[PDB]
Amino acid sequence: YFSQGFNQKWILDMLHAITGNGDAYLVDNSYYLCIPLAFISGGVNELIFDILPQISGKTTVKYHKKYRLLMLKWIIRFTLTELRSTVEKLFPTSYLSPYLFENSSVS
Amino acid sequence: IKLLEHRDLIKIKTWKYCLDAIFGNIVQDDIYENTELLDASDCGVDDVVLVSLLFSYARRPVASKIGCSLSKAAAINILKHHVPKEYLSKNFKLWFAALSRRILQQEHLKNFEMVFRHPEQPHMIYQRISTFNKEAELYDSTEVFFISECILTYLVGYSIGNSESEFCFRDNIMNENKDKVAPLDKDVLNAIYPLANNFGMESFICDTYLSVNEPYNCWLSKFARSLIHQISFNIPPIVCLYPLCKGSTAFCELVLTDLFFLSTTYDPKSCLNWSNRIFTQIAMLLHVKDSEIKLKMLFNVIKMIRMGSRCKERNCLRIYSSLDLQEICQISLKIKEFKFGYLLFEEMNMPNIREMNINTLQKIYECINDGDFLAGLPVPHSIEGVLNRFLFNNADFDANYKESLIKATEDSGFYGLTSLLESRLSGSSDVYKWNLELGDWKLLTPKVVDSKAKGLYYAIKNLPQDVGFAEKSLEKSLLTIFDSRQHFISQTEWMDTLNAIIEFIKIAAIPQDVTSFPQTLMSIMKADKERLNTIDFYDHKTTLKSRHTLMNVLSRNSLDENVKCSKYLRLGSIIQLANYVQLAIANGAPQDALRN
Amino acid sequence: WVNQIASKISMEENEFQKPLQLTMKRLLYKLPYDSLYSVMSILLYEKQSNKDTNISQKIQAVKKILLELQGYDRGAFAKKYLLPVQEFCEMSVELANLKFVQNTKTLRLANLKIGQYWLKQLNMEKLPLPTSNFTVKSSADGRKARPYIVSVNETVGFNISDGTTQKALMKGSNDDLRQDAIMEQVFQQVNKVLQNDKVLRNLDLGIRTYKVVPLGPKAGIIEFVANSTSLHQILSKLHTNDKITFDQARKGMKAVQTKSNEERLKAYLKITNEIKPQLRNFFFDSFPDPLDWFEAKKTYTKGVAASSIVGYILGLGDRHLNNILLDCSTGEPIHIDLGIAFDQGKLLPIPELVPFRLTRDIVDGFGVTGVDGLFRRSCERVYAVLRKDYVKVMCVLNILNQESYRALKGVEEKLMGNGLSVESSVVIYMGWSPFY
């Protein structure tokens, strides 16, 4: 995820670390970590997934989504949210009132 | 609450009585505190747990209660599954006592098959997994909860698809196995590679936990290896198994065992675990070499007992039994009984039933029951006696010239003798028994560790001021009985000690009439008449004598103030004591019938 | 005593029989839900076998009693339960009698085939329970029964409360042939006395268990999954290793034929070679309950500690291992279908010495684990306690020709006699695997 983002900045042990990789096509599954970052990352929103990967196979690009998204939401690392929930609720849901109720509640 | 309460829905009375409180008061004493549709119990245990607060949060305790809302299955839930000790008691514990008699009045083959059934198919594992996921912690916000769901998904999710032909094979057709699991999952389980995200070893687990290495690490069972007895111990035994068949295990087992990094409660599954690991041979005999080496904790022995028990259980199916027939005989026929186990010893006699004794083994045999004649050989022929009644025993004991005679003496009717024979000395921090039979007390206040008849006696004789102030000391005395029992002094049937103090709670103040007072009085008459059960005709004469002492102590302090009630209640008293005698006597020794 | 009430209904309506019948009618009308047996049992045998006396008259009398009861709820409504129950019993009896098709393989079920014993499992709605149990207080409204839930039979394999249930059959069993109901009444007495002694509220044993033996419908000790098996089956199945087992089976035959005496010097004295402690197997392995390995043994032993006194109290015969139950988990052995309630000191060949039967099985059953000599405390108490009430016990047993009197008094003498205190009881006559 982040050394890949560091790119040129990750100049020392990060390059050395390439040698620590398992050569037995670890990447066939291990590359999912970068794709997972793509599911849970933006900025360039490129390179980490697809490109040299692919094989979405419908399922691969789903099985890797739980950890690729079950984290993407978490990635906000934020916590205002109730106010945003009520704003999101503008979509119309009946229970939209619940979002408003949350907005009406103390922080 | 109003928003959803006013949906009305069904049943209503239970939750209505509940919702009506909190904000103010509680009331509904006739009902919620006594004869309401019971909210106390039905299914699960959440009912028995919440109901206590309805007594705690005001309301007249139970008021007089008198009746009930019936029980049956409820009685079971209330006494068996409930037990939420912390603070929700007070009126509720009084309610429990208000139940008392009404409650009492109501009163691995599959693994063995697996042991000698298709070893190639871990069908028992699949059955346990499905059972567990159907009903488990039922939401505790923990990592057990979190992981339980994480792994159920690799099961069924991979099986229903890629396994194709197998698909949680065992009964994944015959009993629609894993259908419930599928309902609960059937999604894109992160590729087993995602086990790296399960916190699991993502590299150690089964590969790392070599069984022989584990045995070597465990060599430090000297003592400092108990730091987690029953925890690291159970886990390590299983970890060893995980390595033993890391390769022989089914596909994607590694994701499971792996993630299971720091996972327990699998103890019931651990029997299936070692049963099919390697299976053919185990020429390490790790469970043999440790015949009795690691002494760090008794639990660990318990697990070892089940280990050994299953080893024999599997053998009896007439299987290969490579470890069992290469295991242990003496020790397996000698040590577990050191502590207990209705099989350490007993089982040891069946394979060991030749011509052998050993005083120590004889002791154990005789100690656990044995029909009071256990191997009753010799003795009489040569030199008899010295075998536990105390009648004669006292002849020769003092013939040459006390506990061996004192209990036996009290059992022979002389309370007037044991009270002198060991009025003090040692072993009897009680002595209360003698004083209660007589009503003397005079022990200052040895209140620490005091129950049954004795607990009643201390509370009973210790009555400051005199009469009129019945309600004040009356409450203190019942509560004392409920709190003393928490040291488990009388634990088993302890709840019956509440009845003696409670009849006093019901008849001590009784300002009503005093001239005729039938209100608690006629009820006691009938209850004692039908007061059959009393465990035995021993406490019947001790807890009862303490109850009689209250009658007389309250009166002793000021029988004259009582005037009109004195006349009636004393008539009621002698009459009931007489009624007691008339329908009693037949229930015990004539010695007591005559002494009183 | 309900079977005695039925037994005693007779022809002398002028006195006693009139109020005796009042009792029978009263109980059948208000609680028919737990009574039928005796009506149907006398009917079935008499119709199939009577060239004698009185029972045929009794049949005509019962027909009139029941004819009126089915028509006297207020009217015919009594029959809604009462006739239906009698008809169900009759149909079942006919079906059992007709089931002796011989065949060969241990199968041939096809459920009921054409019989309405499954096709109509939920036909009589509430399947009146032929046995089982249900009660309220001292009588009260005790018509509340699993019969409602019992309306199930299953096909070519229920339990009223989903529990478990089995049935006894042996390629028939003629209901009409029911006999030795007396032994069953004795079992009722065993438990009855047990409870009469109030100490039962702590004590154990007494046991009993019953079926619908009135119509020869034995209960199957099955479905209970409480380790039941016939005793002779565990024994014949194990009979193998060590020595050879046929050797004593043949000695137990060859040594016997005589026109006077002499058997022990032909077999009893020789079959005693190479005696070592044995078996253990099922009894050791079938219920590994550690804390319960023992409790099961203890429970079993106690049951057997008493049956020794009770069984060997009457002179009840047969037994021969074949009529004894084996069980586990707990387990409480009972006698099955026994008659000839007298010593019978030699049933044809075999000079029986008529001791209580242990036949090695008890000797190892306890000797193996609990060694021996301790059963006494229980047995002495089981026996001695009877003298506390003494006459109370005998007054029932007196009801429950010189040979009958002799045996009865002999039992009284056995209960009392003289020495008592400890006492004892007892070569051997063979045939019945008298070594195991």
Q: Please, is B31 exposed, middle or buried when counting C-beta atoms within 10 Å of its C-beta (0-12, 13-18, 19+)?
A: middle
In Å, what is the CA distance from B466 to each residue of B471, B472, B503, B570, C395?
11, 11, 19, 17, 57
The span from the CA of B385 to the CA of B395, in Å, is 12
**B156 touches B126 (CB < 8 A):** no
The span from the CA of B155 to the CA of B393, in Å, is 70
Other Cβ atoms closer than 10 A to C104: 7
Q: Which residues pair with C324 in a beta bridge?
A: C335
* Closest to C297 (Cα-Cα) out of C308, C286, C312: C286
In Å, what is the CA distance from C182 to each residue of B291, C214, C397, C400?
57, 10, 11, 8
How many CA atoms does the CB half-sphere of B87 hold within 13 Å? 1
**C72 touches C78 (CB < 8 A):** yes
For residue A31, give the chain B residue with the closest CA: B193
Partner B contacted by C224 (CB < 8 A): no
* Those residues with Cβ within 8 angstroms of residue A25's Cβ, 6 or more apart along the chain or in another chain: none
* Closest to B256 (Cα-Cα) out of B366, B156, B328, B142: B156
Q: Which residues of A touch B187 (CB under 8 A)?
A: 66
Maximum distance among all Cα pairs of chain B, rounded to whole angstroms? 93
Name the token pair of C48: 């199939």
Name the token pair of A17: 């670390």
The span from the CA of C283 to the CA of B141, in Å, is 47
Q: Which residues of B touch A66 (CB under 8 A)?
A: 187-190, 194
Residue whose pair of structure tokens reads 């103090």 in the numeric block: B501
Name the token pair of B497: 């000690």
In Å, what is the CA distance from B399 to each residue of B89, B383, B392, B395?
56, 18, 10, 6
The span from the CA of B173 to the CA of B193, in Å, is 29
Closest-CA distance, B350 to chain C, in angstroms, reads 5
- Name the experiment that determined this structure: cryo-EM
Query: What letter represents residue B167's amino acid?
Result: F
Record: contact C297-B346, CB cut-off 8 A: yes
Q: Which residues pair with A20 in a beta bridge?
A: none
The span from the CA of B100 to the CA of C78, in Å, is 43
**C147 touches C127 (CB < 8 A):** yes
Please give the DSSP secondary-structure letter assigned to residue C324. Answer: B
Query: What letter represents residue B124's amino acid?
Result: M
Phi, psi of C168 (to 5 degrees): -100, 135
Residues in chain C: 436
Task: Show which subunits contact A, needing at least 3 CB pairs below 8 angstroms.
Answer: B
Is C230 in a helix, a strand, or coil? strand
**Concatenated DSSP letters of B117-157:** S-TTS-HHHHHHHHHHHHSSS----SHHHHHHHHHHTHHHH
Helices (H), C286-401: 291-311, 361-367, 375-384, 386-389, 391-397
Q: Which residues of B touch A64 (CB under 8 A)?
A: 188, 190-191, 194
Q: Which residues pair with C19 in a beta bridge?
A: none
Query: What letter represents residue C410's amino acid?
Result: G
Q: Which residues pair with C262 in a beta bridge?
A: none
Long-range contacts of B188-191 (CB under 8 A, 24+ apart): B188/A59, B188/A62, B188/A63, B188/A64, B188/A65, B188/A66, B188/B157, B189/A63, B189/A66, B189/B153, B189/B154, B189/B157, B189/B158, B190/A63, B190/A64, B190/A66, B190/A67, B191/A29, B191/A32, B191/A60, B191/A63, B191/A64
In Å, what is the CA distance from C229 to each residue of C184, C224, C233, C328, C431?
20, 11, 7, 9, 22
The span from the CA of C310 to the CA of B383, in Å, is 34
Write out B455-487 in H/E/C secondary structure. Answer: HHHHHHHCCCCCCCCHHHHHHHHHHHHHHHHHH
Phi, psi of C324 (to 5 degrees): -115, 135
Q: Please tell me what resolution, in angstroms, this structure has.
A: 4.3
Q: From the centroid of its chain, how far is CA A23?
A: 26
The span from the CA of B99 to the CA of B34, in Å, is 10
Nearest CB partner across the interface for C288, out of B312, B351, B374: B312
For residue B154, give the chain A residue with the closest CA: A63
* Those residues with Cβ within 8 angstroms of residue C262's Cβ, 6 or more apart along the chain or in another chain: none
Helices then strands (H, E): number in chain A? 8, 0
Name the token pair of B165: 């032909």
Name the token pair of C130: 């032929």
Q: Which residues of A touch B193 (CB under 8 A)?
A: 29-30, 32
Q: Which helix (DSSP H) or strand (DSSP E) does residue C79 occupy?
A: helix C79-97
The span from the CA of C239 to the CA of C245, in Å, is 6
Helices then strands (H, E): number in chain B? 32, 0
- Inter-chain contacts counted by CB atoms under 8 A, chains A and B: 28
Is C325 in a helix, a strand, or coil? strand
The span from the CA of B295 to the CA of B540, in Å, is 45
The span from the CA of B565 to the CA of B516, in Å, is 8
Q: Which helix (DSSP H) or strand (DSSP E) does residue C326 occupy?
A: strand C325-326
Residue whose pair of structure tokens reads 């004692």 in the numeric block: B528
Record: contact C377-B373, CB cut-off 8 A: yes
Partner B contacted by C302 (CB < 8 A): yes
Partner B contacted by C373 (CB < 8 A): yes
* Those residues with Cβ within 8 angstroms of residue B534's Cβ, 6 or more apart along the chain or in another chain: B540
Other Cβ atoms closer than 10 A to C331: 21
Chains A and C touch (3+ CB pairs under 8 A): no
A interface test, pick of B3, B188, B198 with most A CB neighbours within 10 Å: B188
B interface test, pick of A1, A29, A58 with most B CB neighbours within 10 Å: A29
Is C96 in a helix, a strand, or coil? helix
The span from the CA of B474 to the CA of B509, in Å, is 8
Record: contact B371-C284, CB cut-off 8 A: no
The span from the CA of C29 to the CA of C78, in Å, is 7
* Closest to B200 (Cα-Cα) out of B145, B260, B266, B148: B260
The span from the CA of C271 to the CA of C265, in Å, is 10
The span from the CA of C42 to the CA of B255, in Å, is 71
Please give the DSSP secondary-structure letter assigned to residue B32. Answer: I
* Those residues with Cβ within 8 angstroms of residue C419's Cβ, 6 or more apart along the chain or in another chain: none
* Closest to C47 (Cα-Cα) out of C197, C177, C152, C154: C177
Name the token pair of C394: 């005998």
The span from the CA of B351 to the CA of B344, in Å, is 12
Record: contact B368-C294, CB cut-off 8 A: yes
**B323 touches B285 (CB < 8 A):** yes
The secondary structure of chain B in percent helix, strand, coil, rounded to multiples of 5, reads 50, 0, 50
CA angle C312, C316, C319 (to 5 degrees): 95
Name the token pair of B228: 């987690």
Q: Which residues pair with C326 in a beta bridge?
A: C229
For residue B336, give the chain C residue with the closest CA: C290
Chains C and B touch (3+ CB pairs under 8 A): yes
The span from the CA of C328 to the CA of B581, in Å, is 45
Record: contact B373-C294, CB cut-off 8 A: no
Terminal Cα-to-Cα distance of chain B (whole angstroms): 63
Is C335 in a helix, a strand, or coil? strand
Q: Which residues of C touch B350 (CB under 8 A)?
A: 280, 283-284, 368-369
Please give the DSSP secondary-structure letter assigned to residue B76. Answer: H
Other Cβ atoms closer than 10 A to C406: 12
**B371 touches C300 (CB < 8 A):** no
**Concatenated DSSP letters of B531-547:** ----S-TTGGGTHHHHH
Query: What letter represents residue B317's amino acid?
Result: L
The span from the CA of C39 to the CA of C152, in Å, is 25
